[PDB]
Symmetry: none
Subunit: 169 residues, 2 copies
């Protein structure tokens, strides 16, 4: 049937993983989303003229057991690694998330996008060059996003889908 793409959003708490998911799914910005809510979202889209379904797991803290986490991490085809451009710690924490994906997927070639969220905020502590440099080093795309403005949210998810398509071609 219709192609399904299983995506997982990873990153340090507070970077805007839920705001980005919900912007994509529900086309609105939520100012408060309880940190501990972990859940998956399905949305039909058209990417480069291809009608497909995005199956997205919005991840929370790595403390608590999630039955959903097990299946997705196992079966996921693509990952958004999200940092916040006003959170230096979160950008420093990116290599971790990527090394955990490689280990769980037992593979050095997992489709991934590097996402710098909160581009709507005027004091960046993580600049464009540093983000471009990391992504280049990983051989993945970097996309600047605002969950509040919708800036580049579609771009990030569509770029991961395109990255998955190339992993099969």
């Amino acid at each position: 049937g219709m192609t399904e793409y299983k995506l997982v959003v990873v990153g340090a708490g507070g970077v805007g993983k839920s705001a980005l998911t919900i912007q994509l799914i529900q086309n609105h910005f939520v100012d408060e989303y309880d940190p501990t809510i972990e859940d998956s979202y399905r949305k039909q889209v058209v990417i480069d003229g291809e009608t497909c379904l995005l199956d997205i797991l919005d991840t929370a803290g790595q403390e608590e057991y999630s039955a959903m986490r097990d299946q997705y991490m196992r079966t996921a085809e693509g990952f958004l690694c999200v940092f916040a451009i006003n959170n230096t710690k979160s950008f420093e924490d990116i290599h971790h998330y990527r090394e955990q994906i490689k280990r769980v997927k037992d593979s050095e070639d997992v489709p991934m996008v590097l996402v710098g969220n909160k581009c709507d905020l005027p004091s960046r502590t993580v600049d464009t060059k540093q983000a471009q440099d990391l992504a280049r080093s990983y051989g993945i795309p970097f996309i600047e996003t605002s969950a509040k403005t919708r800036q580049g949210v579609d771009d990030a998810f569509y770029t991961l889908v395109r990255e998955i398509r190339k992993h099969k071609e």
Copy 2:
């Protein structure tokens, strides 16, 4: 195996995409064809003395998933972009369709014809020069048609096929 040309008709609802297809297929003008109906038509024709088959998808621009739509947009060889000369909005909407075509065909060199329909009407708000100028900008032909009078309907479709023949030359 007889040569098949897969054509897709695109444009804003109400420009006469269905009227033009049915004029070509059934050699009559239909005043009432459900705006939301999308389907494909196959018709044997003779172009410049070549007996070929036209496989045309008359698009309705609907939301629900259609495997046939996806197949046609991916496998198509040529596109009619249709506006109505008494519909300024529809001519303004032409760039959107061309950009969708570029994205799905993964190319900036896709056989295309710009079609200005309803030249039987005296209330023209989109003049010949502006249509010629857009087509020149895109590097494609512009053809004036009337589904009701059957003016240039054959010309529109046969012009697209010739454009496809040159792409494959």
